[PDB]
Homo-oligomer: A and B are copies of this chain.
Amino acid sequence: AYRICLIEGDGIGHEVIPAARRVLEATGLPLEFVEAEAGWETFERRGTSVPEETVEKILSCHATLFGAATSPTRKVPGFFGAIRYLRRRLDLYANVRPAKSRPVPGSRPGVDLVIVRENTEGLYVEQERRYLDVAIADAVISKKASERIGRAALRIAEGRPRKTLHIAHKANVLPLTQGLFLDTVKEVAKDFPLVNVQDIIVDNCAMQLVMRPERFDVIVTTNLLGDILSDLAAGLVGGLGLAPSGNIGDTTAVFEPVHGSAPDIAGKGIANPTAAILSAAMMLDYLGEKEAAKRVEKAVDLVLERGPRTPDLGGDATTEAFTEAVVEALKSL
């Protein structure tokens, strides 16, 4: 049996995570669910957005599915954001963001790519200083983190049909940091004979994602860069509302939708569980259940295409009805 940690988090995490739990159970796989809490609502109760227990429960399971974390408007004494934290604490060094065409209004066809972003360093070391009216931030690239992220993106590419990786970078303007990242990935790519490795300057890569996204298979890049390119690519195929995500290290992983807590629509029973369900499909895949992953994805596609749709997506099916449809389509495969 697999042990899955479920963390609902904030707002509509309380609706999409139960949705995904149901779909997961409909796979027929041996699944044991543990619950834990994190995020703003948690913070408002216990002065921390990731209690120690939640770390312990995470580490006790094969994988974790997380719902939503509320973006703080004001800055709040003591309130570190939860995903940012778990990334560091659990060393989830690889951020995996697929962008795939879905049968939905205004989403380009012919897109099927995976953006693998370094999750640990670059501008995200968060080592800023302000002296008089000048502020400075470290942007840090190491050979170690670059190998780690290189090998991850390479493992992902090699299990995909087109066997292709683009290293997106800015080595021309930043040859010491960004060049180190470019070169290390190229170096590490040598134990992956089956993969075609190109490199592309990040600004041009963004342009190419808009004009010719069908050109890409897997893209590897650094922290801020990948942040932008993922979110770029999601606009191509539905926006954040349908964007799944993995956060993967060597011992455990956390999967989450990218949409926030959606504070308005929360509690209203109309949130679309797609992002959460697809994240759960990513999770099944990471666990080694490739068939179920593909079955879960196929189910979601069918309901997105023909079955009842949620108000973000045209229709006025509830989360319940949408989830019901997905469960049905899944059981029939």
Q: Interface of A with B (CB < 8 Å)?
A: 71, 75, 84, 106, 121, 123-144, 170, 172-177, 179-180, 202-204, 206-211, 224-225, 227-232, 234-236, 239-240
Known: A123-B174, A172-B71. A207 touches B232 (CB 8 A): yes
Are B136 and A136 in contact (CB-based, < 8 A)?
yes
Can you list 9 A-B pairs with a CB-CB distance of less than 8 A? A123-B174, A126-B173, A126-B174, A128-B176, A131-B142, A136-B139, A137-B140, A138-B139, A208-B235
Q: How far is the CB of A171 from chain B (nearest CB, A)?
A: 9
User: What is the CB-to-nearest-CB distance from A77 to chain B, in angstroms, rounded to a whole number?
Assistant: 13
Q: How far is the CB of A49 from chain B (nearest CB, A)?
A: 14
Question: Is A227 in contact with B203, judged by CB distance below 8 angstroms?
Answer: yes
A125 touches B131 (CB 8 A): yes
Report whether A132 and B129 are in contact in the complex, using a CB–CB cutoff of 8 Å.
no
- Does A175 contact B210, Cβ atoms closer than 8 Å? no
- B residues near A144, Cβ cutoff 8 Å: 132-133
Ranked nearest first, the 3 interchain pairs of A and B with the lowest CB-CB distance are A210-B235, A128-B176, A133-B143
- Which B residues are in CB contact (< 8 Å) with A142? 131-135
Are B207 and A123 in contact (CB-based, < 8 A)? Answer: no
Is the Cβ of B137 less than 8 Å from the Cβ of A136? no
Query: Of the candidates B126, B129, B130, B202, which one forms a contact with A228 in the assembled complex, judged by CB atoms under 8 Å apart?
Result: B202
Choose from B175, B180, B235 the contact partner of A206 (Cβ within 8 Å): B235
Is the Cβ of A210 less than 8 Å from the Cβ of B228? Answer: no
The answer to whether A124 and B173 have CB atoms under 8 Å apart is yes
- Contacting pair B170 A135 (CB below 8 A): no
Nearest chain B CB to A268's CB is how many angstroms away? 21
Q: Which residue of B lies closest to A243 (CB)?
A: B207
Closest B residue to A179 using CB positions:
B135
Residues in chain B near residue A231, CB distance under 8 A:
203-204, 206-207
Chain B residue nearest to A227 (CB atoms) is B203
Contacts of A172 in B (CB 8 A): 71
CB-CB under 8 A from A179, the residues of chain B are 135
Cβ A135 vs Cβ B128 within 8 A: no
Closest CB in chain B relative to A282 CB, distance in Å: 19
Residues in chain B near residue A106, CB distance under 8 A:
211
Contact B139 A139 (CB under 8 A): yes
A108 to chain B, nearest CB (A): 9
Question: CB distance A135 to B228 under 8 Å?
Answer: no
Interface-centre pick from A106, A134, A142, A179 (highest chain B CB count, 10 A): A134
Contact assessment for B75 and A175 in the assembled complex, using a CB-CB cutoff below 8 Å: yes
> Assuming the A-B contacts A143-B133, A227-B203, are A173 and B123 also in contact, with contact meaning beta carbons closer than 8 angstroms in the complex?
yes
Instruction: Indicate whether A207 sits within 8 Å of B239 (C-beta atoms), given known contacts A75-B175, A126-B173.
Output: yes
Find chain B residues with CB under 8 A from A210 CB: 210, 232, 235-236
> How far is B131's CA from A174's CA once the two chains are assembled, in angstroms?
15
- A107 to chain B: closest CB distance in Å? 10
CA A175 to CA B77, docked complex, whole Å: 14
Also in contact, A177 and B138, with CB within 8 A (given A210-B235, A231-B203): no
B residues less than 8 Å from A235 (CB atoms): 206-211
